[PDB]
Amino acid sequence: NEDEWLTTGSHFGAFKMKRKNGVIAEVKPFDLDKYPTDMINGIRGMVYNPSRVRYPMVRLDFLLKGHKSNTHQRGDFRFVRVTWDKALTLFKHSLDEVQTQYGPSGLHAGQTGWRATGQLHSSTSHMQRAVGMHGNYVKKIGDYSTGAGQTILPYVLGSTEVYAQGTSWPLILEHSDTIVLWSNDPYKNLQVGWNAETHESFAYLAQLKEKVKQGKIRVISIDPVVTKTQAYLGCEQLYVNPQTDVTLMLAIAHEMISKKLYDDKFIQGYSLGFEEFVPYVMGTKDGVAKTPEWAAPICGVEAHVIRDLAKTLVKGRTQFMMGWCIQRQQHGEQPYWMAAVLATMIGQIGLPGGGISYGHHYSSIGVPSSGAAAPGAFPRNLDENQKPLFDSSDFKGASSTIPVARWIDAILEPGKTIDANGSKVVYPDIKMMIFSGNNPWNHHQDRNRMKQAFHKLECVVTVDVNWTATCRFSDIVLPACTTYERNDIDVYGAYANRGILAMQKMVEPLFDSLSDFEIFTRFAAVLGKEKEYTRNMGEMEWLETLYNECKAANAGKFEMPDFATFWKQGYVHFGDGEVWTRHADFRNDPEINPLGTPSGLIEIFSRKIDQFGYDDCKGHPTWMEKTERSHGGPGSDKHPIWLQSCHPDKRLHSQMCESREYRETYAVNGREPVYISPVDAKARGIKDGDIVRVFNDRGQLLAGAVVSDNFPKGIVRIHEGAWYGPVGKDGSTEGGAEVGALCSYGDPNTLTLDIGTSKLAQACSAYTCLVEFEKYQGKVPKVSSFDGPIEVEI
Ligand SMILES: Nc1nc2c(c(=O)[nH]1)N[C@H]1[C@@H](S)[C@@H](S)[C@@H](COP(=O)(O)OP(=O)(O)OC[C@H]3O[C@@H](n4cnc5c(=O)[nH]c(N)nc54)[C@H](O)[C@@H]3O)O[C@H]1N2
Ligand SMILES: Nc1nc2c(c(=O)[nH]1)N[C@H]1[C@@H](S)[C@@H](S)[C@@H](COP(=O)(O)OP(=O)(O)OC[C@H]3O[C@@H](n4cnc5c(=O)[nH]c(N)nc54)[C@H](O)[C@@H]3O)O[C@H]1N2
């Protein structure tokens, strides 16, 4: 059937779609988008796939025995189907039992993640609002991306920096001589955004490729691996041993002292503490000068190459662009801190195309905003007019808010006391947990340790669109529909604010699935508080209310038509903006425009932190050895290979791994691909296409061989997001519940360690990992990850 195209959008971009034979016929890019992503070929598979959640289900023994069931069985995949009313009655009864027997400290419902775009249907917000109307629970602070970075920068530059707007791309293209990409791959990571992604940044990357060819701009990539960006631009690379970056920075600062290359004016007028740091680099107290000769065998860079780099950074106007990966390792606050110190010693902060950036690889930061106000959202909290059924604040002496990544450690040892960014934290006694809009069995580390911690839980509830590993390890499960099976509203470009889009319903929700609004409105009915929850409005009434409010705010500078007209058009345009320079104000007059630090200047040495007395984070940057390190680091005698689980090029974390046809374009021999170097492959007799087994003293998995020159000796890669699918010793689905079971597909976190960054931020350290690998020789199993549950009938 040939009809008019409809409008919509997602984290991958804005689209245009047409329907035929009652199904979505085809996807086309939105007109204004000139650089779409290849992942546009996987969209249709996300809605029509084999891992779809058909109806509500409850785990066998839990259905039969309630909170007194055999928890050792989680993971075997056997479930029983039930009606919506029965499933909701059970859910509520469980919340009753826990508030009564234990109280608020025994429930954890605050985990967040990459939920789909949409101002009205946002899943995590609907769950928390309804559950709150029942009773309180435990919350968290932080995230898995910039955990350490966001905790340290406020002390140095006076802000988190990572999520702020930066210097405009044009100003950079016209003034920068050298652009340093340190642990940064923007060509690959710019394909997605927080809101509908405009992809504007790709036009500027194209202009950059020109400058590189003409020989007008020099780009240097400091990375242990050859990146996608380096290949696209045709620029150079500087190898560095993984995790040894800090020794290089210290050596560079040593050259600048000896041969007077640092800007003395900027230091004296814009910072504090330089004179307290010098002694360390110079070795006047500890006994060792941090010279290039010293750093060389550690970082893997020759003394003369280090001196050459130093002269280059002061030769012209230099612009630093740091990624996020480097701070996701043990002591991750150090490289971020020491970087800011180098930028200060150079003294080009505040100039167009000079200084340092921590985010030009995220949601098109660098393209100027229109200046318009964006639309509001559905509330995730109770309204001033209401109260919950219970409402107790007794946490039995424990903390009501914990560091995001310490949640497993708390289930394992309640009542323990930990240090945390200048305060004390006490772990609560958790018995029940709720998940919506996130996938814990993908994002956390150490699968086999997580299995032991789960044995101590009484109830686990999950709402998702597909049968993910998290659902596989739950007690009650509820089905939701995709954004293409409902109506919503969203802004175009998280930082651009180019306009406002319309997310129109394409087809009817499949099977027994429901929209997140519907799911929690029914729950509110059980509690007898339906109207209060919804504010007495439906889907379209809510959307119309949010548009009108946005139009009200923008009344002064932007014109907008009425809702009826807007919906028919499917889009409303805002405009372009003017260029801007990041730290120009503080530069012009630091007396008038100080920073948010305690003194108002840049702090190379902080009195505040030094006062804490922490052993693994002191008054100034230092080099400290890690627990597991390659190329001569501790532990490389038994497990020589470094494992990096860098973000995927053809997925958004775990989202899209379910798209059948599209996935089969990169899968190898049924498994997820492992990228291996020629030298290491030869030493083990491995060839392309062979099934490989990667392991260590904590876990084991299977994967497909891919030999590549982009990987140096001693390093392998397996992308984060590959679905966890364990099997027994006989290759069965059910045996997958066993502690120590082999993963038939290849999830990297099956081999990772659960450690805290340092006493300062207590964040994720996933990249500190050592392993070993061999050619798999045993009976080959079938993948259990994508085929859904075993249905048991009573
Ligand atoms: N080893 C290693 N570990 C890492 C990382 C690493 O570099 N290495 N990187 C990490 C970071 S940066 C982050 S962002 C993280 C990602 O996991 P996550 O947030 O759960 O998103 P996700 O994985 O995409 O899963 C989101 C789930 O949400 C569901 N969903 C999405 N939208 C909807 C919706 O509208 N309603 C409902 N009911 N659910 C919805 C998805 O189906 C998915 O299962 O994993 C970190 N961990
Ligand atoms: N296509 C796609 N886009 C996305 C995402 C996605 O899932 N898919 N997710 C997004 C979110 S969640 C966030 S957190 C972000 C990821 O940033 P980042 O960790 O820096 O990318 P990274 O790729 O994990 O790492 C970048 C580089 O860091 C190098 N590296 C890693 N460790 C070190 C080290 O110690 N020393 C040095 N010098 N460099 C190191 C890596 O080689 C990689 O090139 O990317 C978003 N964009």
Curated annotation (Swiss-Prot):
This enzyme catalyses:
trimethylamine + 2 Fe(III)-[cytochrome c] + H2O = trimethylamine N-oxide + 2 Fe(II)-[cytochrome c] + 3 H(+)
Residues binding Mo-bis(molybdopterin guanine dinucleotide), per UniProt = S145
What induces it, per record? By TMAO and DMSO.
Identify the GO cellular component terms for this protein: outer membrane-bounded periplasmic space
Might you name a Gene Ontology BP term for this protein?
anaerobic respiration
Q: Is Signal given among the entry's keywords?
A: yes
Q: Does the keyword Coiled coil apply?
A: no
Tell me which domain of life the UniProt entry assigns to the organism this sequence originates from: Bacteria
EC number(s) per entry: 1.7.2.3
Q: Could you tell me which SUPFAM superfamilies the record lists for this protein?
A: ADC-like, Formate dehydrogenase/DMSO reductase, domains 1-3
Q: What cofactor does this one take?
A: Mo-bis(molybdopterin guanine dinucleotide)
Q: How is the cofactor bound?
A: Binds 1 molybdenum-bis(molybdopterin guanine dinucleotide) (Mo-bis-MGD) cofactor per subunit.
Subcellular location field: Periplasm
Enzyme class at the top of the EC tree = oxidoreductase
UniProt PTM: Predicted to be exported by the Tat system. The position of the signal peptide cleavage has been experimentally proven.
UniProt KW keywords:
Metal-binding, Molybdenum, Oxidoreductase, Periplasm, Signal
In alphabetical order, the GO MF annotations are:
electron transfer activity; molybdenum ion binding; molybdopterin cofactor binding; trimethylamine-N-oxide reductase (cytochrome c) activity
Q: Name one Pfam family in it.
A: Molybdopterin_N
What NCBIfam families does the database record attribute to this sequence? Answer: PRK15102.1 (NF011682), torA (TIGR02164)
Protein family membership? Belongs to the prokaryotic molybdopterin-containing oxidoreductase family.
Q: What does this protein do?
A: Reduces trimethylamine-N-oxide (TMAO) into trimethylamine; an anaerobic reaction coupled to energy-yielding reactions.
Task: Identify the PANTHER family for this entry.
Answer: TRIMETHYLAMINE-N-OXIDE REDUCTASE, TRIMETHYLAMINE-N-OXIDE REDUCTASE 1
Q: Other remarks on record?
A: Although torA is induced by both TMAO and DMSO, only TMAO is used as a natural substrate.
Name of the protein described by the UniProt record: Trimethylamine-N-oxide reductase
Q: According to the entry, what is the taxonomic lineage of the organism?
A: Bacteria, Pseudomonadati, Pseudomonadota, Gammaproteobacteria, Alteromonadales
Give the gene symbol. Answer: torA
